[PDB]
Amino acid sequence: MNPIIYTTLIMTVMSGTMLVMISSHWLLIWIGFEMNLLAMIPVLMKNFNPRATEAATKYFLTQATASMMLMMAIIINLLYSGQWTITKMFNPVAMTMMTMALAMKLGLSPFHFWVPEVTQGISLQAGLLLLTWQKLAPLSVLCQISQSINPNLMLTMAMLSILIGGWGGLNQTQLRKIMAYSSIAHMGWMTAVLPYNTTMTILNLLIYITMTLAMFMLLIHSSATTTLSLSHTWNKMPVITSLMMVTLLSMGGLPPLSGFMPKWMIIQEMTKNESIIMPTLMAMTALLNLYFYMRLAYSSSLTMFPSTNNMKMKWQFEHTKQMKLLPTMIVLSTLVLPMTPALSSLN
Amino acid sequence: PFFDVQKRLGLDLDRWMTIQSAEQPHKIPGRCHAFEKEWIECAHGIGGIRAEKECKIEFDDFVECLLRQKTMKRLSAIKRQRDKLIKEGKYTPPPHHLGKEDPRP
Amino acid sequence: LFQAEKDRRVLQMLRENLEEEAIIMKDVPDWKVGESVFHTTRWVTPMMGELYGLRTNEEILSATYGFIWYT
Amino acid sequence: PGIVELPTLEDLKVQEVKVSSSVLKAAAHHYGAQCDKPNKEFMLCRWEEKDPRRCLEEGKLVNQCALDFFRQIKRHCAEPFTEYWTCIDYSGLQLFRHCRKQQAKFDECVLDKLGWVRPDLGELSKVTKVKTDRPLPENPYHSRARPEPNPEAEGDLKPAKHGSRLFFWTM
Amino acid sequence: MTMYIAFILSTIFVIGFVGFSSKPSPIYGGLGLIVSGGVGCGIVLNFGGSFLGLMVFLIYLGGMLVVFGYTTAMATEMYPEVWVSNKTVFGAFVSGLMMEFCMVYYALKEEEVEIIFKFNGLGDWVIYDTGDSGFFSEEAMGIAALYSYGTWLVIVTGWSLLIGVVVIMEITRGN
Amino acid sequence: MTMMSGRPGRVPLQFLPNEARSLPPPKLTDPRLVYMGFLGYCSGLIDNAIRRRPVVSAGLHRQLLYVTSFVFFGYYLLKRQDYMYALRDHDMFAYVKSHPEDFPEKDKKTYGEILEEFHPVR
Amino acid sequence: MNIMLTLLTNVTLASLLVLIAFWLPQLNAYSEKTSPYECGFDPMGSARLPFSMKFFLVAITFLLFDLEIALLLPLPWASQTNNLKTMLTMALFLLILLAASLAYEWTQKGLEWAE
Amino acid sequence: AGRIASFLKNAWAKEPVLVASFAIGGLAIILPSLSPYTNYAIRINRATPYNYPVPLRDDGNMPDVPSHPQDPQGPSLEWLKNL
Amino acid sequence: MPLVYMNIIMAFAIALAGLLMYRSHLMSSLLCLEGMMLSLFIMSTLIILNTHFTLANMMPIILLVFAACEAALGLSLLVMVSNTYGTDYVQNLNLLQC
Numbered sequence A: 001m002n003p004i005i006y007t008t009l010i011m012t013v014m015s016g017t018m019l020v021m022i023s024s025h026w027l028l029i030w031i032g033f034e035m036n037l038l039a040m041i042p043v044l045m046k047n048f049n050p051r052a053t054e055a056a057t058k059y060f061l062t063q064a065t066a067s068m069m070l071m072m073a074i075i076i077n078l079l080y081s082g083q084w085t086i087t088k089m090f091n092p093v094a095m096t097m098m099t100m101a102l103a104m105k106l107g108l109s110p111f112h113f114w115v116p117e118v119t120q121g122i123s124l125q126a127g128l129l130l131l132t133w134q135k136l137a138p139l140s141v142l143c144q145i146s147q148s149i150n151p152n153l154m155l156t157m158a159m160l161s162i163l164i165g166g167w168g169g170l171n172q173t174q175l176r177k178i179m180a181y182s183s184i185a186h187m188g189w190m191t192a193v194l195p196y197n198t199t200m201t202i203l204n205l206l207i208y209i210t211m212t213l214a215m216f217m218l219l220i221h222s223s224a225t226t227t228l229s230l231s232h233t234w235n236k237m238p239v240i241t242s243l244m245m246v247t248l249l250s251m252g253g254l255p256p257l258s259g260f261m262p263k264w265m266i267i268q269e270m271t272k273n274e275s276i277i278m279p280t281l282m283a284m285t286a287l288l289n290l291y292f293y294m295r296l297a298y299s300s301s302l303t304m305f306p307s308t309n310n311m312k313m314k315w316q317f318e319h320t321k322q323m324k325l326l327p328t329m330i331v332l333s334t335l336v337l338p339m340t341p342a343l344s345s346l347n
Numbered sequence B: 001p002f003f004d005v006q007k008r009l010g011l012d013l014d015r016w017m018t019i020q021s022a023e024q025p026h027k028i029p030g031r032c033h034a035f036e037k038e039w040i041e042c043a044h045g046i047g048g049i050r051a052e053k054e055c056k057i058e059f060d061d062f063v064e065c066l067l068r069q070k071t072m073k074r075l076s077a078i079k080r081q082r083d084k085l086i087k088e089g090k091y092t093p094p095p096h097h098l099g100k101e102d103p104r105p
Numbered sequence C: 001l002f003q004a005e006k007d008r009r010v011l012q013m014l015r016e017n018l019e020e021e022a023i024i025m026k027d028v029p030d031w032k033v034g035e036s037v038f039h040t041t042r043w044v045t046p047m048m049g050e051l052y053g054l055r056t057n058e059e060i061l062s063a064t065y066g067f068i069w070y071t
Numbered sequence D: 001p002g003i004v005e006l007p008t009l010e011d012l013k014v015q016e017v018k019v020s021s022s023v024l025k026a027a028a029h030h031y032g033a034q035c036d037k038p039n040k041e042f043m044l045c046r047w048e049e050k051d052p053r054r055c056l057e058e059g060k061l062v063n064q065c066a067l068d069f070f071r072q073i074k075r076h077c078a079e080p081f082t083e084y085w086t087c088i089d090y091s092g093l094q095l096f097r098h099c100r101k102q103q104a105k106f107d108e109c110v111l112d113k114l115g116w117v118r119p120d121l122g123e124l125s126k127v128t129k130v131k132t133d134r135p136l137p138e139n140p141y142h143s144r145a146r147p148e149p150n151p152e153a154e155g156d157l158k159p160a161k162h163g164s165r166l167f168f169w170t171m
Numbered sequence E: 001m002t003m004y005i006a007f008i009l010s011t012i013f014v015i016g017f018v019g020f021s022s023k024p025s026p027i028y029g030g031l032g033l034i035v036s037g038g039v040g041c042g043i044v045l046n047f048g049g050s051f052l053g054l055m056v057f058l059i060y061l062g063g064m065l066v067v068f069g070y071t072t073a074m075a076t077e078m079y080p081e082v083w084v085s086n087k088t089v090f091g092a093f094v095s096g097l098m099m100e101f102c103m104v105y106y107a108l109k110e111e112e113v114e115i116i117f118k119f120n121g122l123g124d125w126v127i128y129d130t131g132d133s134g135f136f137s138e139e140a141m142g143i144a145a146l147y148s149y150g151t152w153l154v155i156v157t158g159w160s161l162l163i164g165v166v167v168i169m170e171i172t173r174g175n
Numbered sequence F: 001m002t003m004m005s006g007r008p009g010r011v012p013l014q015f016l017p018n019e020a021r022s023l024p025p026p027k028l029t030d031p032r033l034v035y036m037g038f039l040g041y042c043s044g045l046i047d048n049a050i051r052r053r054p055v056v057s058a059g060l061h062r063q064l065l066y067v068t069s070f071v072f073f074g075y076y077l078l079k080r081q082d083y084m085y086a087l088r089d090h091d092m093f094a095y096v097k098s099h100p101e102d103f104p105e106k107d108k109k110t111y112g113e114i115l116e117e118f119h120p121v122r
Numbered sequence G: 001m002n003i004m005l006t007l008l009t010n011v012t013l014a015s016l017l018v019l020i021a022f023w024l025p026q027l028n029a030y031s032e033k034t035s036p037y038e039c040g041f042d043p044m045g046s047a048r049l050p051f052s053m054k055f056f057l058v059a060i061t062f063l064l065f066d067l068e069i070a071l072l073l074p075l076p077w078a079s080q081t082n083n084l085k086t087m088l089t090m091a092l093f094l095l096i097l098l099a100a101s102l103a104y105e106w107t108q109k110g111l112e113w114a115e
Numbered sequence H: 001a002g003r004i005a006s007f008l009k010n011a012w013a014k015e016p017v018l019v020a021s022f023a024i025g026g027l028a029i030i031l032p033s034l035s036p037y038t039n040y041a042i043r044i045n046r047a048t049p050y051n052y053p054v055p056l057r058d059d060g061n062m063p064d065v066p067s068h069p070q071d072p073q074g075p076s077l078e079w080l081k082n083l
Numbered sequence I: 001m002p003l004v005y006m007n008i009i010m011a012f013a014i015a016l017a018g019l020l021m022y023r024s025h026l027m028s029s030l031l032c033l034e035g036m037m038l039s040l041f042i043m044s045t046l047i048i049l050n051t052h053f054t055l056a057n058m059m060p061i062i063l064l065v066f067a068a069c070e071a072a073l074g075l076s077l078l079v080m081v082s083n084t085y086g087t088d089y090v091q092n093l094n095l096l097q098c
């Protein structure tokens, strides 16, 4: 694919997301979603390798079904009140339809099935895009209509996402599927606090995005897509494995690392609304994510796996293209907790 | 989330089409222009939480204009009572309700 | 002139409907004759179910589809 | 929530203008020039009151003025007018363009019989002013009292007392 | 209840939807979608939407033609299925017809609420406007306002169509 | 829910309203600014480590740019955070003042008049 | 109503013609007569086997180009607006983008049939 | 100055259809911006009375508003009949 | 709500159920997608015509445009899948698991 065509398709994806986030008309939000999907399909197929065709087909079917449901919710809302502005969704049936459509777009359980498959089917750069930039538009729409979201349905889907991400990640040796299940669990954490405080949702989204960018850039630097391939990195770049272990610890929510800040900030918020059992279940369920991060840390950094003879050749060559924002990403994803009160700048 | 660039720049990308009481071509009005105008002027500036309670009368009138549920209920009741009165035969509807009227210009 | 005649025609049809309503629903438990459905007291344009509700199907078909079906 | 007030069948009685559409179109320009004042008074009442029940007398005066206009036309020369509106009425679109000789004859009769001057292109579509003694309605929409707004933000901005006050943070 | 024209058209619309949703051979699915498109055009015409109905019928006919061409190439299935050639397709078709009939019966004689609201029938002629004015078409004026009011819509739609051409040519490249 | 997005008089994308100039700016020796600079320095060290350069002394211009960028961004971030907290306190105090019936001043008894249950430890 | 009558009349006339065509003459149908025609010899495979489309990309492009004419058709009514400059700018913009898409497909060999 | 002439000659020899299309499209783009009749077209569109002109309540100090359609005040369409 | 509105809504629900229940062909599912788009067009047009929302009359046309972009997209994918398997059956899309 031509570099100019790639650049214009990336611009179209970000333009669809921006159109969703700056529009006050439901039709323009739907158009932004349509444009985003249209430009996103070829990005997943940049390398042909028919698994990418399967991933793109599954992604297209899921997103198009969600778009159809979204348009129906819009039309029902218009029918019961001649309103096109994005507001508290005067009709409840339309509100349920939109909640389900946005959950399907995000990949919340039980609409989560497509995420591991699509992430495994595409390249690491496409997975980075899909797991970071694609979450903004549905979450931005959900934040605008949060005052009308049925808490029961959203909290059920959030708990299901946390549980299913934690359980699904345990059985994975492929790194991309591990990232997908982590994404599902973090999505559940994001949407659990949305009906109570959208600033906490934005804070969790930002912290998750920086941690995910760090992890994906680290997996790009050492071209590993499996556990056994990542177990060879210590014999070529020990620093990369050390930073990967620290980032994995942060994603597990361990203090005093950055990943502890969202959960800590969410539980507290949920307690001010007299929600006690729910945060306790979510906090105990996140230990599954911690476990399957710790297993990867064991395989890649805390122990030394056997290597191969040809790795000696690789000792003579340096990484040519460098990611400039990787050091900032690692620092922001680990050493940021003391600056927690800065979250007030998000509201 | 919502980045209000239209408000910051005064651009009006899509706000012209949000409501039906907003500057139609050839000044063609919506079916419920007055009701929506009244509801909007009631609910302006007081917030959604206050508007949902204090402008409920205007919004209910606007919804009645939009869907006409009460009007259909009333007409259905009237026609049902008329059918009951005619089936046993003590109504005899007037000639101008049967087609024997003298029309006016 | 057309507006004046239209106003008189609509008002007369509404009045005839009201007079027939006063007779049809004489013995309905708590039916208030001529009761509006809107909280407001301003004029509201009739719905054509309010004007041709008590009339034959021919004039209803005319008033509804005569212009569309005319070719 | 209230009884809809309706006029009686007597109050809606009026002497009808029972001419056909082609007859009205043949005389449309002269009629618009001659009966302009009552027509504009009725239209101003209609667009200001937003209620047909409040402008019935103006409509009756409109009908009366139209009747006088047609009475004058019938009394002075009805043959040229009939010849004009017949050719107008033949056309399926009722085109002025196809009756220019009959229109000329009618105009020449009414110019000397009554002094009537046919309005030029652009005149009947002007926005005009109307002198009326009818008071301007105060609340035509029958609006309710608008709810009071949330009060205001007043005063100066001082630093937060003891900082953010978030858990152990002292700033 | 007057001439039942709108109700009959809507029922045929639903029947065509059931026909192509039972998923027989895509030839017959295209036929069912064409029938639904024509009937929906009729429905929209019965409400004063001449341009919109004709427009959607014209668009669908063209779209279906491409689908037929693609079906003959990639969805051929040596023994193509009709609605009575398989128990699954016939069962889905009968289920759709029965559900449509049950819903109509529940909403017709009585006034039942299925999901959102209820219905008594009364014919769709009740909710019309009575508006008597105009030397133009309101629908045509609203559609033509796209080039004066909807500049933003034209911009985004044109960019999307150009991107769609680029996108299809990228996807079908292969290599 | 969003608590202060719809605050009246708010400019959409300002990041620093005019009224914020009424507040004392953070000192340049603010420990939070020092932590911002420390984060920049750590980013520079990690950049040296990944690029396989002498970590402590490889690029002094690059490390200086890292520290300077972090401090520069952190200063405005601290200003916005302080302004937002001041706004929260201002609104809370105003709302308490304007709703006296909801925050009634209560005369407090002394511990010589309050009867607390005694629970022996035995 | 008149168009519905016209459609019913046309369909009825065509169906009646089919009925007379199938019920008036004498039919002698045997297996050899009704067999498929392939120039005197039996077909090798089925006619329901896949048939390759060499113009598939042009066929897909036809959908977008067909929606563009739906976008362009309200132009006679759009030419009556007061903001003539804006309407003309948007109409020319739409046509220019259509022409640019056609040019892009042409230059990248999108109009050539597959071999 | 000399390259464009050779390119145009080759295009006219090989693809006259494309040359004609580009010339006609360029003329369609440029000419409306240089024509004095575009303003006249806008004025003609503005002169068409699709809706009723609602009269104004005479407050007493609007000299430019007519009191009768045939009064000299108000917009004039004399420029149109001579066009 | 009149009977026409619930008939259109029922058509949408039927088309959604048809999409969500795959048989074998991807083309059948794409036809269900087009049917959902058509039901949305009819519903929105009926609402806009009934309420005389003049500007919104341009909305359904736009809705048609992005319908085609979805069809042309889907058809494109159907080509590529076919080129891999000689068949548009959805059972062949099973290289990636959960």
Ligand SMILES: CCCCCCCCCCCCCCCCCC(=O)OC[C@H](COP(=O)([O-])OCC(O)COP(=O)([O-])OC[C@@H](COC(=O)CCCCCCCCCCCCCCCCC)OC(=O)CCCCCCCCCCCCCCCCC)OC(=O)CCCCCCCCCCCCCCCCC
Pocket (backbone or CB within 6 Å): A001, A002, A003, A004, A006, A007, A008, A010, A011, A012, A014, A015, A016, A018, A019, A022, A125, A128, A129, A132, A133, A136, A202, A209, A213, A217, A220, A321, A323, A325, B001, E155, E156, E159
């Ligand atoms: C609440 C506040 C907080 C807000 C938070 C916001 C969200 C936070 C972040 C969200 C998540 C971020 C995820 C990033 C996705 C990255 C994906 C990617 O590109 O590949 C991964 C990439 C792959 O690495 P690689 O393997 O080494 O690269 C190999 C190549 O890909 C091999 O491929 P190649 O050979 O083809 O190489 C081509 C290469 C080389 O590129 C070139 O050669 C350049 C040539 C120029 C081509 C000319 C094109 C011009 C014509 C096209 C016109 C299109 C118009 C469209 C508009 C239509 C309008 C309707 O180009 C690229 O690789 C990608 C180009 C990227 C272009 C980006 C343009 C942005 C578009 C913005 C649109 C918005 C407009 C306004 C909208 C208005 C509404 C309508 O890795 C990274 O890039 C590292 C990650 C960096 C991400 C950024 C980190 C966070 C951001 C920090 C910055 C500050 C942000 C806040 C700013 C606030 C405002 C000031």
Ligand SMILES: CCCCCCCCCCCCCCCCC[C@@H](O)O[C@H](CO[C@H](O)CCCCCCCCCCCCCCC)COP(=O)(O)OCC[N+](C)(C)C
Pocket (backbone or CB within 6 Å): A203, A206, A207, A210, A332, A333, A336, A339, A340, A341, A342, A343, A345, A346, A347, B001, B002, B003, B004, F002, F005, F011, F012, F013, F014, F015, F039, F077
């Ligand atoms: C891991 C830590 C987070 C890293 C995030 C990226 C860091 C780089 C900084 C990003 C630069 C962009 C922000 C500065 C440009 C000006 C911003 C301005 O234009 O926008 C304002 C917005 O300003 C931003 O919100 C402030 C950005 C500050 C981000 C830092 C907060 C991080 C949380 C605390 C963790 C500590 C990390 C500190 C750094 C080490 C307008 O506000 P408003 O339109 O009305 O609200 C929008 C949201 N609403 C409507 C839904 C309410």
Ligand SMILES: CCCCCCCCCCCCCCCCC[C@@H](O)O[C@H](CO[C@H](O)CCCCCCCCCCCCCCC)COP(=O)(O)OCC[N+](C)(C)C
Pocket (backbone or CB within 6 Å): G016, G017, G019, G020, G023, G024, G025, G026, G027
């Ligand atoms: C130009 C367009 C407009 C035309 C307007 C007229 C429309 C005409 C309708 C079109 C059909 C034309 C067909 C003409 C021949 C008739 C064929 C058939 O009807 O006759 C037999 C019908 O008879 C059946 O065998 C059964 C007869 C009785 C059983 C059912 C009928 C019950 C009706 C009661 C009859 C009792 C007396 C009624 C007095 C009114 C079937 O014979 P069959 O061999 O297959 O077909 C080949 C006909 N051949 C021989 C001429 C070649």
Ligand SMILES: CCCCCCCCCCCCCCCCC[C@@H](O)O[C@H](CO[C@H](O)CCCCCCCCCCCCCCC)COP(=O)(O)OCC[N+](C)(C)C
Pocket (backbone or CB within 6 Å): B013, B023, E148, E149, E151, E152, E155, E159, G083, G085, G086, G089, G090, G093
């Ligand atoms: C600040 C951002 C600039 C850089 C970022 C670019 C990203 C945006 C893409 C293009 C921005 C242009 C959109 C601006 C909105 C247009 C509407 C507004 O500007 O007014 C219109 C002005 O539009 C004019 O036609 C000129 C602007 C059209 C520009 C031509 C198209 C160029 C767009 C190219 C970028 C899009 C993506 C790439 C496509 C190739 C019409 O005004 P008017 O009709 O008086 O009054 C209407 C109200 N009435 C009806 C009540 C009377």
Ligand SMILES: CCCCCCCC/C=C\CCCCCCCC(=O)O[C@H](COC(=O)CCCCCCC/C=C/CCCCCCCC)COP(=O)(O)OCCN
Pocket (backbone or CB within 6 Å): G096, G099, G100, G102, G103, G106, G107, H008, H011, H015, H018, H019, H020, H021, H022, H023, H024, H025, H026, H029
């Ligand atoms: C400035 C306004 C422009 C916008 C308006 C245009 C309206 C519509 C016209 C554009 C439609 C799209 C056209 C597609 C472009 C075709 C590109 C192409 O690939 O053409 C090549 C051919 O190469 C060319 O492009 C043709 C020559 C260059 C283009 C035409 C001339 C460029 C413009 C000339 C007119 C400019 C003004 C006239 C000058 C007047 C004299 C002073 C095709 O050749 P093959 O198919 O490979 O042949 C195989 C069989 N042998």
